[PDB]
């Protein structure tokens, strides 16, 4: 009987909540009071990158912390040289409605996708001087939202069909299909070990999946709106969640509950991109008020404001070594921020 | 700079020329978005001129791009901001769906949300009330009382069609800055492409005055 099963679901939810309360001894705010505050952090732009003729929707850093890839609505992917502000490549796209981009760890391939429900993958190390597409991944019903590279043969893709999937390069088939999300998922972040990933959906829930098997290990709730971005903590057992409301939540995999909430009354705009620092002490989150806010990951106190864009910031990026922060917005401008 | 550094710099400048050429060419193409509700005459006007289908046609030496997002089957508000800034929005609403909760109430609800959307606070809306031939054979027996209960007119097509058009005209609160164009088309109609050209002509005029700083 469906009614009995529905009632049993509430009982299981109550048991999980009771277990979470039992393991909740103290709060991170109480333990962090004795540590020295970070203070005020001043960030100044160093290199500004121009050439895009439309709003920038995605931007991913390379492994060498020098090459940068950005996607725009003009239908072109530009490989930027951060150090010298140069265009290594300009990959035309058959569809000018992309909203995601990815950089392979080896740098040989660059992936993109959008409303065409195709995750095109382009080869950058061709014998010829041009960038040629390698494989067109088809099988998703909803719009492409995010794509991440685990290796040169497997890519994890999250679409708008409330279903994530893991693809293969040699064969355009879905090796593993992830199901369980009741709403649209518009972001995805991969763990450093390339074994688990967290997807933020429209039902204000973050789900942790395993690549090898495909079932949901844990589920995280607490938000009141659709989650637009998510990013794994440097350590590996935590992640930061940003939603359409004006708050950011940090969840711990081992605790399986919310740790600390970053919010203020002066902010009434959502977060479009969430990123961390190399040491994990600094939390950087974009906002729709044309400003990027730097949050303390341990004290929930603001450290600095990155206000250099005249349009909404859509993507955020921190290099592997943590020596630079790249911020992209809808003003077709890319900026790199660093301390002094 | 070194020998290879200068070559890399020159290569970037060559891409800049290509980007500028592509951007200038793309700026001369009028972008149109098709938002038919449940295939309500959406496919009967494409021939008269995969997730997204792009239709390209030229009228009066003007390039037109038509985008169909009826097959997305996802959340509308997650990608409705990508089409912000289009020249005009083409809306297709059937007229024979009043008899068939109701198929036009969904169209009215869908029209209300997009017309009042933040990203489309100034984009022109081109309503296409097609399937008017079937309206003649359906209004004789089935009246408009089933669809609209607050109807006092007769069963004549002249006044009943205006009532349906009127109900789609007071669904926008920003009447002082956004204007909705309405037309009654059919399968045999051949002037539908002409109406779109006149509709986008006004938008170009407003953009032309914006560029010169007059408005």
């Amino acid at each position: 009987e469906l009614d009995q099963l529905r009632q049993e679901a509430e009982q299981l939810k109550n048991q999980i909540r009771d277990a979470r309360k039992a393991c909740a001894d103290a709060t991170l705010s109480q333990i962090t009071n004795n540590i020295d505050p970070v203070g005020r952090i001043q960030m100044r732009t160093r290199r500004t990158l121009r050439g895009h003729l439309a709003k920038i929707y995605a931007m991913h850093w390379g492994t060498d912390s020098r090459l940068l890839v950005s996607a725009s609505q003009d239908g072109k992917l530009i490989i930027w040289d951060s150090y010298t502000t140069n265009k290594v490549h300009a990959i035309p796209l058959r569809s000018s409605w992309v909203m995601t981009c990815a950089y392979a760890p080896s740098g040989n391939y660059v992936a993109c996708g959008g409303l065409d429900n195709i995750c095109s993958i382009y080869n950058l190390k061709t014998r010829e001087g041009n960038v040629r597409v390698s494989r067109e991944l088809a099988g998703h019903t909803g719009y492409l939202s995010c794509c991440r590279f685990l290796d040169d043969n497997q890519i994890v893709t999250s679409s708008g069909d409330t279903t994530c999937a893991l693809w293969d390069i040699e064969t355009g088939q879905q090796t593993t299909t992830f199901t369980g999300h009741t709403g649209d998922v518009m972001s995805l972040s991969l763990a450093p070990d390339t074994r688990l990933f967290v997807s933020g959906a429209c039902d204000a829930s973050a789900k942790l999946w395993d690549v090898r098997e495909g079932m949901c290990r844990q589920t995280f709730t607490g938000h009141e709106s659709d989650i637009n971005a998510i990013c794994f903590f440097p350590n590996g057992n935590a992640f930061a969640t940003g939603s359409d409301d004006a708050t950011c939540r940090l969840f711990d995999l081992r605790a399986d509950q919310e740790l600390m909430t970053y919010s203020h009354d002066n902010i009434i705009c959502g977060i479009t991109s969430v990123s961390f620092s190399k040491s994990g002490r600094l939390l950087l989150a974009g906002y729709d008020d044309f400003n990027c806010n730097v949050w303390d990951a341990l004290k929930a106190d603001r450290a600095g404001v990155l206000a250099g864009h005249d349009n909404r910031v859509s993507c955020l990026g921190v290099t592997d070594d943590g020596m630079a922060v790249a911020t992209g917005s809808w003003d077709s401008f890319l900026k790199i921020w660093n301390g002094s | 700079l070194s020998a290879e550094d200068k070559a890399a710099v020159e290569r970037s400048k060559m891409i800049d020329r290509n980007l500028r050429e592509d951007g200038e060419k793309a700026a001369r193409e009028v972008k149109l978005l098709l938002l038919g509700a449940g295939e309500s005459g959406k496919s009967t006007i494409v021939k008269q001129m995969t997730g997204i289908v792009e239709t390209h046609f030229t009228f009066k030496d003007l390039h037109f791009k038509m985008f169909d997002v009826g097959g997305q089957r996802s959340e509308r508000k997650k990608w409705i901001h990508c089409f912000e800034g289009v020249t005009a929005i083409i809306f297709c609403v059937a007229l024979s769906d009043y008899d068939l909760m109701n198929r036009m109430h969904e169209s009215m609800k869908l029209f209300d949300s997009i017309c009042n959307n933040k990203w489309f606070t100034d984009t022109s809306i081109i309503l296409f009330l097609n399937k008017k031939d079937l309206f003649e054979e359906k209004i004789k027996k089935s009246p408009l009382t089933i669809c609209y209960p607050e109807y006092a007119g007769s069963n004549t097509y002249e006044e009943a069609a205006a009532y349906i058009q009127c109900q789609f005209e007071d669904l926008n609160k920003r009447k002082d800055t956004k204007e909705i164009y309405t037309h009654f088309t059919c399968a045999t109609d051949t002037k539908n492409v002409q109406f779109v050209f006149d509709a986008v002509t006004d938008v170009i005029i407003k953009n032309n005055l914006k560029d010169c700083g007059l408005f």
């Epitope: 290594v88 014998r127 010829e128 001087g129 041009n130 | 070194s2 020998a3 290879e4 550094d5 200068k6 070559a7 890399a8 020159e10 290569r11 060559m14």
Partner: single-chain antibody, 235 residues
């Protein structure tokens, strides 16, 4: 398949004119830079001219400056080298070499087959080791190289290129930027250096590894090839 075919060679009287054509097929010719390298009979390699992708950047060697002119036809995918006032010192095998900004550098990976040409009648100097080194399979061979000016730029990049010239075959690039390995090159090749002194080490030797090794610098333009080290089988 990348292919470069050179045509337009023959007997030329002194003081005459001749045009060399190098046809490019199998790759994007528009985005690829081109170079002309000539090899005199029983002598080494020397640079002649270079044309950029957009044909707006052209350089010429001091010897052939003015007399020689180079042009390209992107729609026809053909390289042109018009020569005037040919002397007896221009008798050499001309090679068309493609270049592109790749991996942060401009390698010379692909070389043309070359065409015969007989005429009947401040620069950095790269000093190489002895031009006669007897080698045997299974041994490790190190080839030394020297430069008058340090090749280490302010960006931490050293501009060195190593080429292998098989007997009767076009030269093939092995190591570029003194540390990177070209595509298709076996891992047995290693390169190292610091400023002016450079070396190339081969771990395992093979019968197909014989030939003449050349070293060139891409620091300034004015790319001077080395004297050339020849490897011969001991038996």
């Amino acid at each position: 398949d990348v292919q470069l075919v050179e045509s337009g060679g023959g007997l030329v009287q002194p003081g005459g004119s001749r045009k060399l054509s190098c046809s490019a097929s199998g790759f994007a010719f528009s985005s690829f830079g081109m170079h002309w390298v000539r090899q005199a009979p029983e002598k080494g390699l020397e640079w002649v001219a270079y044309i950029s992708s957009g044909s707006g950047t052209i350089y010429y060697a001091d010897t052939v400056k003015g007399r020689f002119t180079i042009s390209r036809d992107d729609p026809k995918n053909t390289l042109f080298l018009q020569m005037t006032s040919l002397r007896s010192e221009d008798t050499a095998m001309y090679y068309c070499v493609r270049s592109i900004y790749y991996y942060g550098s401009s390698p010379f990976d692909f070389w043309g087959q070359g065409t015969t040409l007989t005429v009947s009648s401040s620069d950095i100097v790269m000093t190489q080791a002895t031009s006669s080194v007897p080698v045997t399979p299974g041994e490790s061979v190190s080839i030394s190289c020297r430069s008058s000016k340090s090749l280490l730029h302010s960006n931490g990049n050293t501009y060195l290129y190593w080429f292998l010239q098989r007997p009767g075959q076009s030269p093939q690039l092995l190591i570029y930027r003194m540390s990177n390995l070209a595509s298709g090159v076996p891992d047995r090749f290693s390169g190292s250096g610091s400023g002016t002194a450079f070396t190339l080490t081969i771990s395992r030797l093979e019968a197909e590894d014989v030939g003449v090794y050349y070293c060139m610098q891409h620091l300034e333009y004015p790319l001077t090839f080395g004297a050339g080290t020849k490897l011969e089988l001991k038996a």
